[PDB]
C-alpha cells in the first residue's frame, strides 16, 4: 500500500471521507472492485503496522460482517494526478460481557473500534483525529462509550491526548474500555 492506485480515487470517492458497509456501494470499469482493492490493501497495511500475521480488514470480511468503514482520501493534489488514500477506521457493534469495579459482569453492546490505520508517511499530521471525529459524529457516540479491540499503545496515547481517555477495569475478552464506560463512572 503506497496510497496511490492505478485508477482515479477522486472520481471514485468524491467526498473527503467515504463511509461504506457490507454492500460496498460505489458513491453515485468495475467501481466496486476498485473499492474492494482499496480495502484489501488498507487491511494488509494495517496488519503490518500492528505486527499482525494476517489482515483483519478485507473486502471479503466487510461483505460477511456488519462493520462500517470510513475511508479518508488525500485532499491535496498528488503528482501522478489520480488522487490517493490516507487511511481508514472500521467500527462495528458487538455484544460483550464486561467486568466493572464492583464485581459485576455487565452485558453490553457498544460501538467498537475494530481497525484504524493512517499511512506511515503521514502519521502524526492530524489525519487520525480528523477521521475519528467524523466517525464519532456520524455514529452519535462519545469516546468514553467505545470499546476497542486490542488497542495499540499508540492508539491509547492518541486517545489520552485528544480525548483525555483513561483505561478502566481490564477485561479477559481482548477489548479495552475507558473510565466513563459504566453508568456509575464519569468521563474526562
Amino acid at each position: 500500500f503506497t496510497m496511490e492506485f492505478p485508477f482515479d480515487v477522486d472520481a471514485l470517492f468524491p467526498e473527503r471521507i467515504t463511509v461504506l458497509d457490507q454492500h460496498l456501494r460505489p458513491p453515485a470499469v468495475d467501481l466496486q472492485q476498485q473499492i474492494m482493492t482499496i480495502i484489501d490493501e488498507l487491511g494488509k497495511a494495517s496488519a503490518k503496522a500492528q505486527n499482525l500475521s494476517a489482515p483483519i480488514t478485507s473486502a471479503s470480511r466487510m461483505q460477511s460482517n456488519r462493520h462500517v468503514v470510513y475511508i479518508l482520501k488525500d485532499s491535496s493534489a498528488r503528482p501522478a494526478g489520480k488522487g490517493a488514500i490516507i487511511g481508514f477506521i472500521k467500527v462495528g457493534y458487538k455484544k460483550l460481557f464486561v467486568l466493572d469495579d464492583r464485581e459485576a459482569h455487565n452485558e453490553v453492546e457498544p460501538l467498537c473500534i475494530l481497525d484504524f490505520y493512517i499511512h506511515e508517511s503521514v502519521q502524526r499530521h492530524g489525519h487520525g483525529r480528523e477521521l475519528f471525529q467524523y466517525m464519532l459524529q456520524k455514529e452519535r457516540v462519545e469516546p468514553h462509550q467505545l470499546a476497542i479491540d486490542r488497542p495499540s499503545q499508540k492508539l491509547l496515547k492518541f486517545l489520552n491526548k485528544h480525548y483525555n481517555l483513561e483505561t478502566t477495569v481490564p477485561q479477559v475478552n481482548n477489548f479495552v474500555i475507558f473510565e466513563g464506560f459504566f453508568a456509575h463512572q464519569h468521563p474526562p
Binding site: 500492528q50 499482525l52 483483519i56 486490542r150 475478552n173
Partner: peptide, 4 residues
C-alpha cells in the same frame, strides 16, 4: 475479538 478479531485480533485474537
Amino acid at each position: 475479538s478479531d485480533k485474537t
